[PDB]
Structures are given as C-alpha cells and as structure tokens.
C-alpha cells in the first residue's frame, strides 16, 4: 500500500501533545538537538508509541478516583476508558497523560457513582485544578497523581486540560518520572534527532493558554494528531528510513520547501534559523518519494 499524508492545511491540524489547534510550524532552537516526547508518537507505518492514543480528548487528560482529601487531592488514575490501570502494562504510563514538566491547568469534574434517595440522577461537582508533573507526587505509572484545587473520596473524576497554570517549571522537553525518582521510565518512544549537519527539527507548534502570569508558552509536537490518526488507519509499509515530503501551494502546484519525514515519525529541514515558518494558508505537505539519510535537503 502506498504511503500518504492526509490532505490538511495548517488551520486543520491539531497538536498531538496538548488538545489545541496548531498555530505555526517552527524550526527547533539551537539548544534543542534531541527530544523524546511521548505523546504524538507514531511510526510512518502506523504503530503508536509512548503514551500516544488516538483521541484528542485523551491528550493530557485523565480519569480516576479520588482516594484522599488532604486543597490537595490524591487521585488513583485509570485508563481513559475507565478500566483499571495495570502498572505491569508495557507502556510508560496510562495513554494520554502529560509528557512534559509543568503545572497543567484544567478542570476536575466528578459525577457520583450512585443516585441519592429521591434523585433520578447523580450529584455533580467540579473545580479548577492544577496537576504538577515535575514533582514526586506525579506517579501515573504507579497509578497515582496529586492535584490542587470539595471533592468526594471514592467517586470518579475526569480531568479536562485547558492550559498551564503559569510557566513555572514548564520544560516541554523534559519527560516526567512517570513512576517517580526510584524507577526508570519504561517502554518509552525513542529519542529523535537530526543526524545530517545543518538540519534541525521541524515542529508543529501551539501557544498554550495560561491561567495567570506572564508568558506565551509553546508546545511543539513532532506529528499533528491527524497524521498519527492517518498513519494508524493506512498502515502503509515504510520502504526506507526517510520519506521526502514537499510543502505544496495547491493553486500553483509548486513546492515551497522540502523536508525529511523519518520512519520513526518526525521531520527535519535544512535551516540555519529557529523561527516560525511563514507559509500560505492553503498549503500542505505531500509525500514525494522514499530517500535515505544521505539525501541533502534544499535550504528553506
């Protein structure tokens, strides 16, 4: 089966590491030469990796049960489908959980498991919450995270992400210790990097909302969520380690620039600057052909 990309403009692409629309394509800073994010990870032949799952509503979201009220609550997390999480499962953590250090802001909602006498429907409550992912309390692989905001113990919760609380401790390329400092992370999607001098990573960037403070925080993903979804659907065999892709202006049919789309599921370009890529609104990538690591990209 021939490999393809979905046909989607930048305005039709979603971030795979936070559930928001893409704002820009962006070339990696000089300091960012290797990354190992765990959401938005998928091989070109459709194998999801890391903590990647298919639903936008799963990205940086989680479900679980409140086990303790301390402003702070301990949550025993489940899989997103509500089934109990088995730490023995060969994934880094429940699929969808945040893959970066930061203070994730969203809303925790709670619907009671049973109805009160005289009520035909369950009681509900919900509150703003912060989920720190850089502290020892963030141990989703051990089945527990801590949130700060009442909430009932042993009643199920949903966390809907909105943005970051603030930029304190926001390091998008530092993978959390999913099982705490005593345990190595396991079953990680591998690190990716340019290996051709003068190439750098090409990111799909979103500027996340903030609850407060100064900032315009960026989260960069390797693949849009729709690309992950498409690759999984097609399951097209990869015929080499590198797919040459070109960004097309559809009304002219001309290629504006070219990029390497690597088998592991990430892109590199030939560029000397870290900056937003300025492109027409109607443009999109198209698969050209399979090449190899020695192929030299035209400067963009």
The domain boundary, picked from 165, 181, 209, lies at: 165
Do 233 and 194 lie in one domain? The reply is: yes
- Both 251 and 193 in a single domain? yes
How many Cα atoms are found within 13 Å in the side-chain-facing hemisphere of 175? 21
- CATH number of the domain bearing residue 132: 2.40.30.120
Nearest to 296 by CA among 199, 171, 161, 182: 199
Resolution of the experimentally solved model in angstroms? 1.6
- State the method: X-ray
Q: Are 71 and 54 members of one domain?
A: no
Give the CATH number, domain containing residue 51. Answer: 2.40.510.10
Residues 270, 203, single domain; the answer is: yes
Residue 152 to residue 159: CA distance in whole angstroms: 15
- CA dist 218 and 239 (Å) reads 34
Check whether residue 136 and residue 284 sit in a common domain. Answer: no
Q: 165, 190, 210 — which closes off a domain?
A: 165
138 class by beta-carbon count within 10 Å (0-12 exposed, 13-18 middle, 19+ buried): buried
* 251 and 265 together in one domain: yes
How many Å apart are CA 208 and CA 197, to the nearest integer?
Answer: 31
CB 107 within 8 A of CB 159: yes
End-to-end Cα, the chain, rounded Å: 30
Nearest to 36 by CA among 138, 134, 172: 172
Q: Based on the domain organization, do 117 and 100 belong to the same domain?
A: yes
* Nearest in space to 203 (alpha carbons), one of 286, 284, 269, 247: 269
Helix (H, G, I), strand (E, B) or coil at 226: helix
Q: Which two tokens stand for residue 276?
A: 């937003």
Q: Cα separation of 105 and 209, whole Å?
A: 9
Q: Do 106 and 129 meet the contact criterion of CB atoms below 8 Å apart?
A: yes
Place of tokens 């345990």: 183
- Rg over CA atoms, the chain: 20
Closest to 144 measured CA to CA, from 180, 193, 171, 99: 180
Judgement on whether residues 177 and 49 belong to the same structural domain of the protein:
yes
8 A C-beta contact, residue 157 and residue 110: yes
Do residue 187 and residue 226 come from a single domain?
yes
Number of domains, the chain: 2
Residue 226 CA to residue 234 CA, distance in Å, equals 12
Measured CA to CA, the distance from residue 12 to residue 4 in angstroms comes to 17
**25 and 136 assigned to the same domain:** no
Looking at the chain, the number of H-run helices and the number of E-run strands are 1, 14
Which structural domain, as residue segments, surrounds residue 156? 59-165
Domain boundary pick from 147, 165, 183: 165
Task: Quote the distance between the C-alpha of residue 242 and its chain's center.
Answer: 22
Q: Are residues 39 and 122 in the same domain?
A: no
| Residue 278: other Cβ atoms inside 10 A | 8
CB-based contacts of 55, cutoff 8 Å, min separation 6? 80, 96
Is the distance from CB of 102 to CB of 53 less than 8 angstroms?
no
45 and 113 housed in the same domain: no
Cα–Cα distance for residue pair 298/80, rounded to 1 Å: 43
For residues 33 and 201, give the distance between their C-alpha atoms in angstroms, rounded to a whole number.
Answer: 8
Q: Are 137 and 76 in contact (CB under 8 A)?
A: no
The number of CA neighbours under 13 Å toward the Cβ of 152 is: 13
Q: Fill in the DSSP letter of residue 139.
A: B
């Amino acid at each position: 089966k021939p490999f393809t990309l979905p046909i989607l403009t930048l305005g039709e692409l979603s971030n795979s590491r936070f559930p928001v629309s893409i704002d820009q394509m962006y070339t990696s800073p000089n300091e960012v030469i290797s990354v190992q994010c765990q959401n938005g990870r998928c091989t070109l032949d459709g194998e999801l990796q890391g903590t990647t799952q298919l639903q936008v509503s799963g990205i940086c979201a989680f479900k679980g049960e409140v086990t303790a009220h301390l402003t702070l609550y301990n949550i025993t997390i489940t899989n997103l489908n509500g089934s109990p999480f088995d730490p023995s499962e060969d994934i880094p953590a429940p699929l969808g959980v945040p893959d970066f250090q930061g203070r994730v802001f969203g809303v925790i909602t709670q619907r009671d498991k049973q109805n009160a006498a005289g009520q035909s429907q369950p009681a509900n409550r919900g509150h703003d919450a912060v989920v720190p992912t850089y502290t020892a309390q963030y141990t989703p692989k051990l089945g527990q995270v801590q949130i700060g905001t009442d909430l009932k113990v042993n009643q199920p919760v949903k966390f809907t992400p909105v943005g970051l609380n603030d930029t304190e401790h926001f390091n998008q390329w530092v993978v959390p210790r999913y099982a705490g400092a005593l345990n190595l992370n396991t079953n990680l999607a591998p690190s990716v990097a340019p290996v051709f001098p003068g190439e750098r990573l090409l990111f799909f960037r979103s500027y996340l909302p903030l609850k407060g403070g100064y900032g315009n925080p960026a989260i960069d993903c390797l693949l849009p969520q729709e690309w992950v979804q498409h690759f999984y659907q097609e399951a097209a065999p990869s015929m080499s380690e590198v797919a040459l892709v070109r960004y097309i202006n559809p009304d002219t049919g001309r290629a504006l620039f070219e990029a390497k789309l690597h088998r592991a599921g990430f892109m590199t370009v030939s560029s000397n600057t870290s900056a937003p890529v300025v492109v027409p609104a109607n443009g999109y990538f198209r698969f050209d052909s399979w090449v190899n690591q020695f192929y030299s990209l035209a400067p963009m």
